[PDB]
């Protein structure tokens, strides 16, 4: 592609063709050095920082306990050669 088309720079390299997004999304196509690109909305490729996950602050305390009241018998499919 020609230079100047939404050029964005990261440690992995000079990413051309996708506009940087401040919001963090789950990794779809790993660029490298923590940058991940996804096809999201009219529609263009967005390069963003990785979202390792939803930051969950566990309400720790010296007298706080959480005990589940319900379960989920979830069949997980593990495929092994």
């Amino acid at each position: 592609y020609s230079t100047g088309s939404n050029v964005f720079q990261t440690r992995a390299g000079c990413l051309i063709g996708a506009e940087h997004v401040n919001n963090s999304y789950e990794c779809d196509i790993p660029i490298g050095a923590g940058i991940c690109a996804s096809y999201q909305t009219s529609q263009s490729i967005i390069a963003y920082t990785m979202s390792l996950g939803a930051e969950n602050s566990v309400a720790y305390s010296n007298n706080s306990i959480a005990i589940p009241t319900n379960f989920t018998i979830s069949v997980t499919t593990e495929i092994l050669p």
Binding site: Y1, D28, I29, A37
Partner: protein, 49 residues
């Protein structure tokens, strides 16, 4: 192949339908802009002066 990076991806994978991902299609090499030659002063300068 040379039309756009997508066609370069198709040529690399040898498949018209390429799945979402990142593919090392080629390598970027910066060509030399010009040539510079440097050599010391002419020690055995012929005494034309």
């Amino acid at each position: 192949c040379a039309l756009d990076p997508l066609s370069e991806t198709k040529c690399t994978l040898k498949s018209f339908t390429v799945e979402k991902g990142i593919y090392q299609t080629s390598n970027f090499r910066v060509q030399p802009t010009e040539s510079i030659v440097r050599f010391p002063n002419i020690t055995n300068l012929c005494p034309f002066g």
